[PDB]
Structures are given as C-alpha cells and as structure tokens.
C-alpha cells in the first residue's frame, strides 16, 4: 500500500517513532529545551552551603550528607510535604562533609525555565529573575529517586567558590521530566573543551 510518499519511513503506515517530523518531539522538557525553553513552577526553599571537596559522587556519602542537610530544611524550616516533624533523629554518618542550611528565604515561587544552555529560574515572588542564563558554573544537579525521592536538588556555584545545594519543591509536573531538562541544557555548551 505505497503511494502517499513512497519509502517505508514516510508512508503514514508504520510503528510509532514520530515520523511526521524530522526532530522527534519526545517529552516536553526536551522539545522545549530546543524550542524557546521549558518553564515549570517550583518554589525555592532557601539555600544550604557546603564545605566539602567537589567533583565527587559516593552512593552512600551523597545520601547521608544530602539527606542530612535536606532533613534540617524540611524539618527545622517547615515547607516540604511529608517531613515537617515526626521524630527523625537517627545517627549521622558524616565526618567532614557539610556546611549549614541557610533558611533566609523559605518559600519563593520561581519559574524553572530550561533553555538550550540557559537554565533561567524566573522569580515569581518580588517580580524578578533568578539568573537569566544560569548555565556555566554550577557543580552538581539531580533530583529523582535518591536525594529527596520527590523534590529537586542542584548545588550551583558562580558568585562564590562554595557549592550551594539548592532545595526546591512543588515544581508541578517535573521530577523525572525536569531531570531530563536540566540534563539537556547541561550538555548544551559549558565551553565543551572535550579532553
């Protein structure tokens, strides 16, 4: 049954794989990263600074220090959803890897816009814009199963040489899709020197 546009990958009679367009579409985080740039709504929850080395992963050390600080924020400064107060002492496997949670601005609705190499977080609080092109320094970014298993956390860097773990929640349709966006704009430019 060939006649429309001949060939097999353009005869409107095949499996999925978009086909109608050359790009692909994929989820909205990527389709917009290449387009004008996605834009969700995640409220910021202050910023915690660290004093440990950098360029490190550690599957156990990252969950102990990341959950430790993130615990003092969702607990000491209410704002999260399911971790305000419920007796959560537990030990604290950590010798020299942390800093202090800064709750100077707990609750600051900001639009998380992700463009091709332009993670700009508009400010929906006092009509401002948290960086119109946050995509050059930073240091570590994530927020899926581990870390918070619900919220998003990304340590940034630029004004100072101290990684600042950013804790944000209530993104509105993000978690996995948002992780795909930050990763997209992440590998856009960043002066790809390529070793």
């Amino acid at each position: 049954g060939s006649h429309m546009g001949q060939l097999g990958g353009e005869e409107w009679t095949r499996h999925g794989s978009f086909v109608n367009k050359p790009t692909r579409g994929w989820l909205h985080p990527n389709d917009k990263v290449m387009g004008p740039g996605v834009s969700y709504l995640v409220r910021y929850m202050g910023c915690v600074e660290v004093l440990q080395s950098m360029r490190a992963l550690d599957f156990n050390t990252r969950t102990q220090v990341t959950r430790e600080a993130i615990s003092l924020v969702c607990e000491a400064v209410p704002g999260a959803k399911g971790a305000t107060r419920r007796r959560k002492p537990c030990s604290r496997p950590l010798s020299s890897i942390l800093g202090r949670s800064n709750l100077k601005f707990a609750g600051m609705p900001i639009t998380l816009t992700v463009s091709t190499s332009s993670l700009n977080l508009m400010a929906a609080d006092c009509k401002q814009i948290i960086a119109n092109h946050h995509m050059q320094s930073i240091s570590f970014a994530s927020g899926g199963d581990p870390d918070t298993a619900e919220y998003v956390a990304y340590v940034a860097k630029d004004p100072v040489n101290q990684r600042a773990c950013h804790i944000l929640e209530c993104p509105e349709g993000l978690a996995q899709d948002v992780i795909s966006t930050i990763g997209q704009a992440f590998e856009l430019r960043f002066k790809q020197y390529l070793r």
């Binding site: 950098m54 360029r55 992963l57 320094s137 930073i138 240091s139 570590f140 970014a141 994530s142 927020g143 899926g144 199963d145 581990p146 990304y154 996995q176 992780i179 930050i182 990763g183 992440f186 590998e187 960043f190 002066k191 790809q192 020197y193 390529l194 070793r195």
Partner: peptide, 12 residues
C-alpha cells in the same frame, strides 16, 4: 538521574 556537566564532573 544525576545531572552532571562535562566541565565540573568529568567521567571518561
């Protein structure tokens, strides 16, 4: 799901 850049975190 650990978003990392090739400038700060190098893995290759």
């Amino acid at each position: 799901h650990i978003i990392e850049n090739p400038q700060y975190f190098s893995d290759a």
